[PDB]
């Protein structure tokens, strides 16, 4: 704002506002599953066992 | 972001499988670990013969 009256009385009025805002959200979800199954032999009793 | 990996290995015969194995190593490892991949037979009464 500027105001000059009678070419003698001067006035100035300068205002400024600034608002900055920042947001960040970061999600990670890692899920690992390992499953090993070895079956080597099948052992059975002989039918003639005692 | 979304990653989804599924690995499934199924082995019959040969060295116990592990993920980092090469088919070369596996193929050279069946030298003693051989299993029955197919079989044919006869009914039981067919062998009860005079
Ligand atoms: C997993 O996600 C990455 C990014 O983090 C991507 O480059 C890749 O292609 C995806 N798949 C595998 C098997 O890594």
UniProtKB/Swiss-Prot annotation, chain B:
Organism domain of life: Eukaryota
Gene inactivation effect: Impaired immunity characterized by a failure to efficiently prime CD8(+) T-cells to cell-associated antigens. Defects are caused by impaired cross-presentation of cell-associated antigens. In normal conditions, mice do not show any obvious disease phenotype or a change in immune cell frequencies.
Post-translational events: Proteolytically processed in two steps to generate the Macrophage-expressed gene 1 protein, processed form: cleaved by trypsin in proximity of the helical transmembrane domain releases the ectodomain into the lysosomal lumen to orient the pore-forming domain toward the endogenous membranes, and processed by the asparagine endopeptidase (LGMN). Proteolytic processing in antigen-containing vesicles is pH-dependent. Monoubiquitinated in response to bacterial infection; ubiquitination is required for vesicular localization and antibacterial activity and can be blocked by bacterial cell cycle inhibiting factor (cif).
Glycan attachment points: 3
Induction line: By CSF1 in fetal liver macrophages. By interferon-alpha, by interferon-beta, by interferon-gamma and by bacterial infection with E.coli and M.smegmatis in embryonic fibroblasts.
Protein name from the UniProt record: Macrophage-expressed gene 1 protein
Free-text note regarding domains: The MACPF domain includes the central machinery of pore formation: acidification causes a significant structural rearrangement, leading to oligomerization and deployment of the transmembrane beta-strands (named TMH1 and TMH2) that enter the membrane as amphipathic beta-hairpins.
Location of the protein in the cell: Cytoplasmic vesicle membrane
């Amino acid at each position: 704002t500027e105001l000059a009256l009678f070419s003698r009385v001067n006035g100035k009025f300068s205002t400024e506002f600034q608002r900055m805002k920042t947001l960040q959200v970061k999600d990670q979800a890692v899920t690992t599953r390992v499953q090993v199954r070895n079956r080597i032999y099948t052992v059975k009793t002989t039918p003639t066992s005692e | 972001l979304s990653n989804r990996t599924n690995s499934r290995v199924q082995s019959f015969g040969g060295v116990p499988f592990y993920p980092g194995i090469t088919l070369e190593t596996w193929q050279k490892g069946i030298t003693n670990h051989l299993v029955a991949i197919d079989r044919a037979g006869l009914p039981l009464h067919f062998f009860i013969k005079p």
